[PDB]
Amino acid sequence: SSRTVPFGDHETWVQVTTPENAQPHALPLIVLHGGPGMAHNYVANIAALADETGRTVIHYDQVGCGNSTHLPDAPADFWTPQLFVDEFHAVCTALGIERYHVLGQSWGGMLGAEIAVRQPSGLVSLAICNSPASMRLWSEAAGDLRAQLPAETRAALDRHEAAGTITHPDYLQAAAEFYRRHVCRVVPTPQDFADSVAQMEAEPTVYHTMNGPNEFHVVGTLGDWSVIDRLPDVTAPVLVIAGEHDEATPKTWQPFVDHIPDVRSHVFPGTSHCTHLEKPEEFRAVVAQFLHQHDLAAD
Ligand SMILES: [Mg+2]
């Protein structure tokens, strides 16, 4: 079931998946999508956790994308981590959720960290899935992964970027290969992922503004982003998930494991950025162990 909830003057669309056999003290899980502006669709399958673990799972579309209010006329400086933090708490309040687990994927994990560093009273645990701790590290990682590509594929990327011919078929092929190795290794791209991308391309305000149109580097308003100096303030337990071949390489998420006081990590072999799509059952099994551990602690 689904509805909109108020966030200021806007409407945030939420979806609630209830478990078939609700377990005692299994606290609700709020799933944060990435992009930004990608909508919930690509992380829809994480709702399987409701039946698998006996808890309620909540998805929503962050304001400005998907099924929520579109604001193409907002000034560019409207779109900030603080806005989405405020929205998050507005969703929890309207649904009457006091104590909760958060799982965020890509930008969703960045947003998860922004939520956590602020020490909200209701946060029981956070799962950061496939996320960098700074854009600086994210960019360094892109260069490292390009250095690891076959020489032919790297040459096409380097050569066409240098010339500006970034719609040449060689570049398009080489960029798609990078995507298939490091973003989503399932071919064809899962329809849930395609659906996120389609809605974003139809109305790309949030994604274009915050991430930007550049294939490999963030040139949008997130270009300078970092949460590293606030990570010592996280009081919630944190699980850091990444893929073996993730564009979120180990150096990108190292600050989370180095600076968050209560933290552990899990790296999935044979997966990349969209682990939840590439090995859905394995991904959810690891998440389920973490959620359960902290259900018990909260109780
Ligand atoms: Mg404008």
- The first and second tokens of residue 217, run together, are 């580097």
Q: Do residues 239 and 101 make contact, with C-beta atoms less than 8 angstroms apart? A: no
Interatomic CA distance for residues 79 and 64, integer angstroms? 9
Rounded-to-10 torsion of CA 234, 115, 197, 9? 180
The Cα 197–Cα 204 span in angstroms is 9
Amino acid identity at 176: A
Residue 114 is which amino acid? E
Which amino acid belongs to residue 93?
T
How many residues in total does the chain contain? Answer: 299
Record the tokens describing residue 271, joined without a space.
């997966």
- Spacing of C-alpha 16 from chain mean position: 19
State the distance from the centre of ligand 1 to the C-alpha of 173, rounded, in angstroms: 32
Distance 72 CA to ligand 1 centre (A): 7
Q: Within a 10 A sphere around the Cβ of 72, how many other Cβ atoms? A: 10
Q: State the amino acid at position 4 in one-letter form.
A: T
Give the number of other Cβ atoms within 10 Å of residue 296's Cβ. 9
CA distance 230 to 118: 9
Sequence-ordered list of residues with C-beta below 8 angstroms from that of 109, at least 6 positions apart, any chain:
32, 34, 127, 128, 129, 130, 131
Residue 194 Cα to ligand 1 midpoint, Å, equals 26
List the beta bridge partners of residue 105: 129
Cβ neighbour number for residue 285 with a 10 Å cutoff: 13
Q: How far is the CA of 204 from the centre of ligand 1 (A)?
A: 12
CA distance 129 to 290: 13
Token pair in block for residue 150 = 């076959």
Instruction: For residue 266, list its beta bridge partners.
Output: 241
> Ligand 1 center to residue 246 CA distance, Å?
33
Q: Which domains does the chain have, with CATH numbers?
A: 1-299 (3.40.50.1820)
| Residues with catalytic function | 106, 246, 273
**What kind of experiment solved this structure?**
X-ray
Residues whose CB falls within 8 Å of the CB of residue 105, separated by 6 or more in sequence, listed in order: 31, 32, 33, 34, 42, 43, 129, 130, 131, 274, 276
Q: Kindly give, in sequence order, each residue whose CB lies less than 8 Å from that of residue 28, ignoring residues fewer than 6 positions away.
A: 55, 56, 57, 58, 97, 100, 101
> Residue 250 is encoded by which pair of tokens?
């180990």
Q: How far, in Å, from the CA of 76 to the mean position of ligand 1?
A: 6
CA of 165 to the centre of ligand 1 (A): 28
Closest alpha carbon to 185 in 287, 284, 281, 270: 270
- Cβ contact 211:36 at 8 Å: yes
What spacing in Å lies between the alpha carbon of 218 and ligand 1's midpoint? 18
What's the token pair of residue 107?
């930008």
Q: How far apart are CA 36 and CA 88, in angstroms?
A: 14
- The strand pairing partners of 126, in sequence order, are 102, 238
Query: Quick one: three-class SS letters along the chain?
Result: CEEEEEECCEEEEEEEECCCCCCCCCCCEEEECCCCCCCCHHHHHHHHHHHHHCCCEEEECCCCCCCCCCCCCCCHHHCCHHHHHHHHHHHHHHHCCCCEEEEEECHHHHHHHHHHHCCCCCEEEEEEECCCCEHHHHHHHHHHHHHHCCHHHHHHHHHHHHHCCCCCHHHHHHHHHHHHHHCCCCCCCCHHHHHHHHHHHHCCHHHHHHCCCCCCCCCCCCCCCECHHHHHHCCCCEEEEEECCCCCCHHHHHHHHHHCCCEEEEEECCCCCCHHHHCHHHHHHHHHHHHHHHHHHHC
48 vs 280: CA distance, rounded Å: 9
Strands 238-243 and 100-105: unpaired
φ, ψ of residue 255 to 5 degrees: the values are -60, -30
Q: Phi/psi class of residue 54: alpha, beta or left (left: φ > 0; alpha: ψ in -120 to 50)?
A: left
Q: Please tell me the distance between residue 62's alpha carbon and the centre of ligand 1 in angstroms.
A: 19
Tokens at 228, concatenated: 């590293």
Residue carrying the six token digits 């673990």 = 53
Q: CA 32 to CA 132: how far, in whole Å?
A: 15
Question: In the beta sheet, which residues pair with residue 104?
Answer: 32, 128
Say which residues have a Cβ less than 8 Å from residue 151's Cβ, sequence separation at least 6: none
Tokens of 140: 């360094």
Q: Is 123 exposed, middle or buried (0-12, 13-18, 19+ CB in 10 A)?
A: buried
Side-chain-side CA neighbours of 203 within 13 Å: the count stands at 14
Rounded to a whole number of angstroms, the CA Rg of the chain reads 19
